């Protein structure tokens, strides 16, 4: 799948 | 309400959509993905993606951490091999404060020494949260197998790079890539002249190609289950040829539209349902970057049942390339495509994800209605090629799990 | 414009009703897409031990055989239409729903009559799925978070129906019948206890005919609730062979209509959450979170506020190593007693401004909107507009919190759980003695 | 498994004021 | 040198040199080529499974019974083979004999001794990789070949903490077998060994499909290590020696300490234009099913392909016929030397004795070896390089790779 | 070079 990273200050880390 | 869309002489795009909604929302899409990394600065964006919430000039790390949670907003960061977004959220009554917090991250980051050293070993954590979801080193290896220089560079950071990263190494990276010519100050739930006022005061400031080669990587990891992928050189976005794959995606298999569904309409998963009598999961793989894209599929199965499954897919596509096809599956596949686009942008976030992504690759926003017409104008003789380019084209492959019965490309 | 003006500009929902008993509502919007679903009153709360897990077993055959669209023909027509399909069940509520486009909406409603009412339940699929279920109860051994809440509900509500799981024991799944499902179907799927809802670019009257078309043939004609009590009890599935230990603790919740739930959702957010990724670390606001980032005690924790009819569950879930459990709890209780007694007004404004962005950002699209609608229209009665959620919150101050937390945290009889190396896990007595400051 | 799991009965040990599962607590807890 | 064979396929040899230091080596076909996918990292454990429980003795007693007489118990192991070398004085051979066979003939492989011995693998795995060659070089096999020789000697990480003792008994009972072993000895008489095996050893994998592969390791290490090879030939064929002489034609490493290797056609060929350090030599491997041939590079990051494109060109010069005879006879004289110099030592001597006894069933004295070297053709030394250049390729490297090219480049 | 492993009870570990 077209993977994408995602972090934040308050959104939990994730992987698309 | 309609979508403003402008451009400054400095190459700095702005848009805005005052929907009169409560939740203001801003996203600053930028071209800073790890394709712009060279060999020596790898695993950098993985750090920069967490370098948010650090010291600035206009503010401290502490104050920003609290100043947001007082109004109760957010500071999320999407980052791709192309791009690097600084998404936020808040209520519209306090946008002016959160604006200032943002730009100080991008415009006046000091990147001091000691805050980084505490923040480096975080990478070991973040690197491993993904790889609990095992896709995220299979999939990186495709780029690292197929492509060479830019897109081969993973989002995440290798181990050894940790404890060796320099702050100076960022200032070169920042001063070269957070630039008024290649940015996009998108907003939402907010008026346009405001954003026009901000950038002119603070953002008033100033890599190679993806040479496809054909590569192959293997990972005997002892994991009981299998993960694999076979692809071919695709086309970049903008070309209607790109959509020809993205419709073929839905022809072939797009994942379960139905919970616990047998995906019967999908020509692929149906094609393996014969002969096989055990679990497996598989779908089309479509990627479409600016320089190029990638297309193929992604496999899940047991160890002994890897090539037994793939040799349906690699055959099933050849059936398509040999002209064997019907029209309702296509129009069905189009209707799938026409759905998932709107359904993706149903949410403001997923909406936002499309707005500036066009503003960077293109310099224009296409409303969805115009998108559907280009989908309407697709040719079966291009959907074929398409698969012919896949089959006739050079190949790249990767997989993980046990590999006691995994074949190679030529097999 | 402003915030308060924005909430008044929202599309105010529209409600309908039928002779059979089926509530219907919707909300127009400028979204060209749309979604529809069927939120109802049914779950493991009403199944007995003989039919436990059944409503989950209903979930897997309802899309695998009907009277007019048998087999994958039903599954086919969606993929031909280009839409998604999704479902889930809860201990009280169950929901089927669709995401599709506006113009193809009429085809959708025609299906759910063929699904809900006219399910076929082929014996082959009954037996095939009967293996699929037993495949998953092996899988959910891995879903350690879901293990805990399953244990937790099984303790505080012991002896009641609600202690049941949602998927049920393996045994009943290996004894279930077509007829128990027929009876179960024949009692719970009824108009007076069902809801239809949708959102997107539609109109409330395009829909009203379809319900009068299809679901007008529904049987519009049933026990009521036993008050499910609460218990303060401890459970512990000691297991040292694992890396870590998912842990949970909670107390009695008030329930849906009880208004102070607004206050508690703040206090959960006053304490907030943290999981091993937020670069704030030391700089964070929740004193719990800062210490957890300081000394790296835990790896993740979360809070919650469940709402059931006359009760709910308030508590938290946290995840740490076997050499750190006691201190987290000592700090954790150290926060609850703080709010029972000493709650700073400025810190309240933190959470009041957290919760606004919660419900709003929760409502980003159409599917979340109809989660609330199909849920509120079985719990609260009406829907509550967002301007009303705000006015309730604006009444809040620290005087309220010190009354509420004193009512539901302080000195109560909590419920505990644990699955992992809980060697450090103190006793329920010590935990309760740590519950009241001084 | 972890769902076939069941809790036994303490009705031989509990207080009389809570044995009726159909009732609710909070009416005797203040006394208990 | 005695040299015999039993009906069970079990070879024996012996050479009573009247020396003080007795010495025994039991060359066996048990290299990790015989491992399948599921039993990987096994020989890395079995290579340390020595000094464990037996039936005829305990782990403790063997550890002390050797050091009392002051002997040794060393274990060489290759992708083909697995040797149990020992040492002692000739006055106490009878004891140390019994200690050996109990390792191979009656190993229990109990549970708990293994669990303590597994995490040792993390140590041994890393001692090598302080010497960075030993994951570059493994990757060649894992890149070029697929099934058998691709399997490394050492053990992957994840395999640790997952190995089974039963998994060995299948491996042992299938591969420590009287048909494919060689009870070599030294400093000892022949009838003794004839007596031992008949009492205790009286008991009963795929091919290396070359494919063409490529692996890369951006490790951040300042220096570079790289290798480019081609499908070679197996031993026994005189074509094999044609490479092993070409090895010395091209470059065989420093015969001279701190020497500029001027006679080596390769290192000389890079000495022009380059003005910085680098080190490089021929790579020759020759297994039973096949071999491998090429070279092994060391340089800086920016100066990888700048160097390789001399080597890949230098070999083409040879393949185009450009060559002289004295370099060949010089290269032969190098080859004729290193063979004898290798077997000058009893250990290195022993390393040759049974290695032939497994691949072949005959020992060739060195004199006969030199004649086959004498009968080599320049038209084969050419293809040779033509097979290299014209043949399919496999490659691997590590270090920084900011300027490392691929094969086709 | 044709690398080979070597361990022992008393020979130090080595790599050919």
| Yes or no, beta carbons of A8 and C275 under 8 Å apart | no
Rounded to whole angstroms, the Cα distance separating E257 from B147 reads: 43
> Which chain B residues contact residue C277 at CB under 8 A?
122, 125-126, 129
> Which chain C residues contact residue D2 at CB under 8 A?
140-141, 147, 150-151, 237
Rounded to whole angstroms, the Cα distance separating C83 from C76 reads: 11
Instruction: Using CB atoms, list chains with 3+ pairs below 8 Å to chain E.
Output: B, F
> What share of residues in chain A are helix, strand, coil (percent, to 5)?
0, 40, 60
Give the tokens for residue C363: 């409502």
Rounded to whole angstroms, the Cα distance separating C228 from C153 reads: 11
List Cα–Cα distances, B107 to B206, B406, E24, E147, in angstroms. 12, 50, 73, 54
The CA distance from E7 to the nearest CA of chain F, in Å, is 31
Looking at the annotation, which residues of C are catalytic? 59
Strand, coil or helix: B150: coil
In terms of Cα–Cα distance, which of C153, C169, C164, C162 is closest to C416?
A: C153
Rounded to whole angstroms, the Cα distance separating E120 from E160 reads: 10
Rounded to whole angstroms, the Cα distance separating B306 from B302 reads: 6
- Nearest Cα residue in chain C from A11: C278
Strand, coil or helix: B256: coil
> Which chain C residues contact residue A5 at CB under 8 A?
none
Residue found by looking up tokens 């086309």 in the block: B235
Rounded to whole angstroms, the Cα distance separating C425 from C427 reads: 7
Rounded to whole angstroms, the Cα distance separating C165 from C147 reads: 10
**Cβ-based contacts under 8 A for chains E and F:** 53
For residues E30 and E175, the answer to whether their CB atoms sit within 8 Å is yes
The answer to whether residue B155 neighbours chain A at the CB level (below 8 Å) is yes
Give the tokens for residue E332: 């032969």
Q: Output phi, psi for E218, to 5 deg.
A: -75, 95
Give the tokens for residue B87: 């998404």
- Count of Cβ atoms closer than 10 Å to residue C311 Cβ: 23
The answer to whether residue A9 neighbours chain C at the CB level (below 8 Å) is yes
The CA distance from C166 to the nearest CA of chain D, in Å, is 9
Give residues preceding each break in chain C, C–N over 2.5 A.
221
DSSP conformation letters of C338-356: HHHH---HHHHHHHHHHHH
Strand, coil or helix: C180: helix
Asked whether this chain's domains C13-221 and C233-436 adopt the same fold, the reply is yes
- The DSSP symbol for C113 reads I
Rounded to whole angstroms, the Cα distance separating C55 from C185 reads: 9
Rounded to whole angstroms, the Cα distance separating C373 from B183 reads: 40
Angle between helix E133-144 and helix E120-129 axes, rounded to 10 deg: 100
Q: Do chains C and A touch (3 or more CB pairs under 8 A)?
A: yes
Domain boundaries C233-436, CATH class = alpha beta
| Yes or no, beta carbons of C63 and B72 under 8 Å apart | no
Q: Do chains C and F touch (3 or more CB pairs under 8 A)?
A: no
The H or E element containing residue B399 is strand B395-401
Task: List the C415-420 sheet strands across, edge first.
Answer: C237-238, C415-420, C245-253, C312-320, C298-307
**What residues does C24 pair with on adjacent strands?**
C16, C196
For residues E352 and E343, the answer to whether their CB atoms sit within 8 Å is yes
With 0-12 / 13-18 / 19 or more C-beta atoms within 10 angstroms meaning exposed / middle / buried, residue B400 is buried
* Parallel/antiparallel/unpaired status of strands E181-186 and E10-14: parallel
| Yes or no, beta carbons of E402 and B38 under 8 Å apart | yes
**What residues does E83 pair with on adjacent strands?**
E76
Strand, coil or helix: B84: strand
| Yes or no, beta carbons of C171 and D4 under 8 Å apart | yes
> Which chain C residues contact residue D4 at CB under 8 A?
137, 169-171
> Which chain E residues contact residue F3 at CB under 8 A?
133-134, 137
> Which chain D residues contact residue C310 at CB under 8 A?
24
- Nearest Cα residue in chain B from A11: B76
Measure the CA angle with vertex B66, ends B62 and B70; round to 5°: 170
Give the tokens for residue E144: 């070029």
Rounded to whole angstroms, the Cα distance separating E109 from E106 reads: 9
| Yes or no, beta carbons of B78 and A5 under 8 Å apart | yes
In terms of Cα–Cα distance, which of E346, E344, E242 is closest to E284?
A: E242
The CA distance from A6 to the nearest CA of chain B, in Å, is 5
Q: Do chains E and B touch (3 or more CB pairs under 8 A)?
A: yes
In terms of Cα–Cα distance, which of C201, C265, C211 is closest to C405?
A: C265
| Yes or no, beta carbons of D21 and C138 under 8 Å apart | no
The CA distance from C246 to the nearest CA of chain A, in Å, is 17
Question: Distance between the two ends of chain F, CA-based, in angstroms?
Answer: 8
In terms of Cα–Cα distance, which of C271, C268, C263, C250 is closest to C402?
A: C263
Residue found by looking up tokens 């498994």 in the block: D1
Our measurement of the distance from residue C104's CA atom to the centroid of its chain's CA atoms, rounded to an integer in Å, reads 30
Q: Is C174 left (phi over 0), alpha (psi -120 to 50) or beta?
A: alpha
The answer to whether residue A3 neighbours chain C at the CB level (below 8 Å) is no
- The DSSP symbol for C117 reads I
Our measurement of the distance from residue B5's CA atom to the centroid of its chain's CA atoms, rounded to an integer in Å, reads 23
Strand, coil or helix: E209: coil
| Yes or no, beta carbons of B164 and E220 under 8 Å apart | yes
Our measurement of the distance from residue C248's CA atom to the centroid of its chain's CA atoms, rounded to an integer in Å, reads 17
Q: Do chains F and E touch (3 or more CB pairs under 8 A)?
A: yes
Residue found by looking up tokens 């491992």 in the block: E35
Q: Is B54 left (phi over 0), alpha (psi -120 to 50) or beta?
A: beta
- Nearest Cα residue in chain B from C269: B72
List Cα–Cα distances, C352 to B75, C77, C340, C396, in angstroms. 18, 45, 17, 9
Rounded to whole angstroms, the Cα distance separating C185 from C51 reads: 12
Query: Which residues are CB-neighbours of B376 under 8 A, at least 6 positions away?
Result: B334
Rounded to whole angstroms, the Cα distance separating B384 from C210 reads: 41
**What residues does E397 pair with on adjacent strands?**
E216, E226
The answer to whether residue B336 neighbours chain C at the CB level (below 8 Å) is yes
Strand, coil or helix: C280: coil
In terms of Cα–Cα distance, which of B280, B277, B273, B253 is closest to B265?
A: B253
- Count of Cβ atoms closer than 10 Å to residue B296 Cβ: 24
Residue found by looking up tokens 């607590």 in the block: D25
| Yes or no, beta carbons of B76 and A11 under 8 Å apart | yes
In terms of Cα–Cα distance, which of B320, B24, B78 is closest to B194?
A: B24
For residues E213 and E40, the answer to whether their CB atoms sit within 8 Å is no
Among candidates E77, E124, E133 on the partner chain, residue whose Cβ is nearest the Cβ of F13: E124
The CA distance from A15 to the nearest CA of chain C, in Å, is 13
Our measurement of the distance from residue E15's CA atom to the centroid of its chain's CA atoms, rounded to an integer in Å, reads 24
Rounded to whole angstroms, the Cα distance separating B382 from B320 reads: 11
Query: Which residues are CB-neighbours of D27 under 8 A, at least 6 positions away?
Result: none
- Count of Cβ atoms closer than 10 Å to residue E317 Cβ: 13
Among candidates C75, C81, C352 on the partner chain, residue whose Cβ is nearest the Cβ of B262: C75
Render the burial of B59-78: b for 16+ CB within 10 Å, e for the rest.
eebeebbebbbbbbbbbbbb
Q: Pseudo-torsion of CA E297, E299, E300, E301, nearest 10°?
A: -20
Tell me the CATH number of domain C13-221, given options 3.30.470.20, 2.130.10.10, 3.30.830.10, 3.30.1490.190. Answer: 3.30.830.10
Residue numbers of C between 123 and 182 with CB closer than 8 Å to D: 137-138, 140-141, 147, 150-151, 154-155, 158-160, 163, 165, 167-171
* Parallel/antiparallel/unpaired status of strands B293-301 and B281-288: antiparallel
Rounded to whole angstroms, the Cα distance separating B104 from E283 reads: 56
Rounded to whole angstroms, the Cα distance separating C85 from A10 reads: 30
| Yes or no, beta carbons of F7 and E63 under 8 Å apart | no
Domain regions of chain C by residue span: 13-221, 233-436
Rounded to whole angstroms, the Cα distance separating C174 from C50 reads: 11
Query: Which residues are CB-neighbours of B152 under 8 A, at least 6 positions away?
Result: B143, B144, B145, B146
Strand, coil or helix: B177: helix
The H or E element containing residue E121 is helix E120-129
> Which chain D residues contact residue C230 at CB under 8 A?
24-26
The answer to whether residue C278 neighbours chain A at the CB level (below 8 Å) is yes
| Yes or no, beta carbons of C138 and D24 under 8 Å apart | no
> Which chain A residues contact residue B80 at CB under 8 A?
4-5
Rounded to whole angstroms, the Cα distance separating B283 from B326 reads: 20
Rounded to whole angstroms, the Cα distance separating C76 from B328 reads: 12
The answer to whether residue E76 neighbours chain F at the CB level (below 8 Å) is yes
Give the tokens for residue E92: 């106490």
- The DSSP symbol for F12 reads P
| Yes or no, beta carbons of F11 and E284 under 8 Å apart | no
Q: Output phi, psi for E6, to 5 deg.
A: -90, 165
């Amino acid at each position: 799948r077209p993977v994408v990273a995602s972090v934040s200050l308050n959104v939990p880390a994730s992987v698309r | 309400q309609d979508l403003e869309f402008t451009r400054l002489p400095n190459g700095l795009v702005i848009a805005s959509l005052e929907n009169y909604a409560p939740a203001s929302r801003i996203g600053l899409f930028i071209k800073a993905g790890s394709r712009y990394e060279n060999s020596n600065n790898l695993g950098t964006s993985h750090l920069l993606r967490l370098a948010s919430s650090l010291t600035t000039k206009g503010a401290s790390s502490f104050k920003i951490t609290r100043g947001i949670e007082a109004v109760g907003g957010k500071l999320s960061v999407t980052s791709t091999r192309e791009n690097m977004a600084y998404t936020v959220e808040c209520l519209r009554d306090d946008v002016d404060i959160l604006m200032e917090f943002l730009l100080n991250v991008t415009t006046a980051p000091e990147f001091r020494r000691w805050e980084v050293a505490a923040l480096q070993p975080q990478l070991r954590i973040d690197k491993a949260v993904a790889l609990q979801n095992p896709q995220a080193h299979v999939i990186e290896n495709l780029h690292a197998a197929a492509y060479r220089n830019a897109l081969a560079n993973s989002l995440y950071c290798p181990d050894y790079r940790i404890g060796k990263v320099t702050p100076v190494e960022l200032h070169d990276y920042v001063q070269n890539h957070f630039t008024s010519a290649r940015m996009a100050l998108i907003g939402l739930g907010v008026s346009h002249p405001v954003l026009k006022q901000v950038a002119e005061q603070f953002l008033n400031i100033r890599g190679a190609k993806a040479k496809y080669h054909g590569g192959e990587i293997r990972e005997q990891n002892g994991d009981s289950l299998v993960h694999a992928a076979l692809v071919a050189e695709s086309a970049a976005i903008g070309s209607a040829e790109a959509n020809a794959f993205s419709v073929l995606q839905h022809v072939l298999g797009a994942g379960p539209h139905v919970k616990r569904g047998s995906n019967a309409t999908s020509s692929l998963y149906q094609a393996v349902a014969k002969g096989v009598h055990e679990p497996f999961d598989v779908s089309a793989f479509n990627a479409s970057y600016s320089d190029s894209g990638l297309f193929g599929f992604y496999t899940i199965s047991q160890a002994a049942s890897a090539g037994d499954v793939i040799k349906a897919a690699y055959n099933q596509v050849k059936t398509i390339a040999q002209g064997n096809l019907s029209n309702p599956d296509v129009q069905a596949a189009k209707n799938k495509l026409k759905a998932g686009y709107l359904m993706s942008v149903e949410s403001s976030e997923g909406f936002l994800d499309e707005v500036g992504s066009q503003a960077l690759a293109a310099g224009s926003y296409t409303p969805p209605s115009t998108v559907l017409q280009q989908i309407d104008a697709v040719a079966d003789a291009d959907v074929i090629n398409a698969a012919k380019k896949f089959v006739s084209g050079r190949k790249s492959m990767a997989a993980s799990g046990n590999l006691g019965h995994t074949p190679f490309i030529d097999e | 414009a402003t915030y308060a003006q924005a909430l008044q500009s929202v599309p105010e929902t529209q409600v309908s009703q039928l002779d059979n008993g089926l509530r219907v509502a919707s909300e127009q919007s400028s979204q060209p897409t749309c979604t529809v679903g069927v939120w109802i009153d049914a779950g493991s709360r009403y199944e007995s031990e003989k039919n436990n897990g059944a409503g989950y077993f209903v979930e897997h055959l309802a899309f695998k055989g009907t009277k007019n669209r048998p087999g994958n023909a039903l599954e086919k027509e969606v993929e031909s239409m280009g839409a998604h399909l999704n479902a889930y069940s809860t201990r009280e509520h169950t929901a089927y729903y669709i995401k599709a486009l506006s113009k193809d909406l009429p085809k959708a409603v025609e299906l759910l009559a063929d699904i809900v009412q006219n399910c076929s339940l082929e014996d082959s699929q009954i037996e095939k799925e009967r293996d699929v279920i037993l495949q998953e109860l092996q899988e959910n051994d891995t879903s350690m978070r879901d293990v805990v809440f399953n244990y937790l509900h099984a303790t505080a509500f012991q002896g009641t129906p609600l202690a049941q799981s949602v998927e049920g024991p393996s045994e009943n799944v290996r004894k279930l019948s077509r007829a128990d499902l027929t009876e179960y179907l024949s009692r719970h799927y009824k108009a007076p206890r069902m809801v239809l809802a949708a959102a997107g670019g539609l109109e409330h009257r395009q829909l009203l005919d379809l319900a009068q078309k299809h679901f007008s043939g529904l049987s519009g004609t049933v026990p009521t609730l036993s008050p499910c009590r609460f218990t303060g009890s401890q459970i512990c599935h000691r297991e040292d062979g694992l890396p870590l230990a998912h842990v949970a603790i909670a107390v009695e919740g008030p329930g849906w209509a009880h208004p102070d739930n607004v206050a508690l959702q703040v206090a959960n957010a006053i304490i907030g959450h943290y999981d091993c990724t937020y670069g704030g670390g030391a700089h964070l606001s929740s004193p719990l979170a800062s210490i957890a980032a300081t000394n790296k005690l835990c790896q993740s924790f979360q809070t919650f506020n469940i709402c059931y009819a006359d009760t709910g569950l308030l508590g938290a879930h946290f995840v740490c190593d076997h050499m750190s459990i006691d201190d987290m709890m000592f700090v954790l209780q150290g926060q609850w007693m703080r709010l029972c007694t000493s709650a700073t007004e400025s810190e309240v404004l933190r959470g009041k401004n957290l919760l606004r962005n919660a419900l709003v950002s929760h409502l980003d699209g159409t599917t979340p909107v109809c989660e609330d609608i199909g849920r509120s229209l079985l719990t609260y009665g009406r829907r509550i507009p967002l301007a009303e959620w705000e006015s309730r919150i604006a009444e809040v101050d620290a005087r309220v919190v010190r009354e509420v937390c004193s009512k539901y945290f302080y000195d109560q009889c909590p419920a505990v759980a644990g699955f992992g190396p809980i060697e450090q896990l103190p006793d329920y007595n010590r935990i309760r003695s740590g519950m009241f400051w001084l | 498994s972890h769902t076939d799991i069941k809790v036994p009965d303490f009705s031989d040990y509990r207080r009389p004021e809570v044995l009726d599962s159909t009732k609710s607590s909070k009416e005797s807890s203040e006394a208990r």
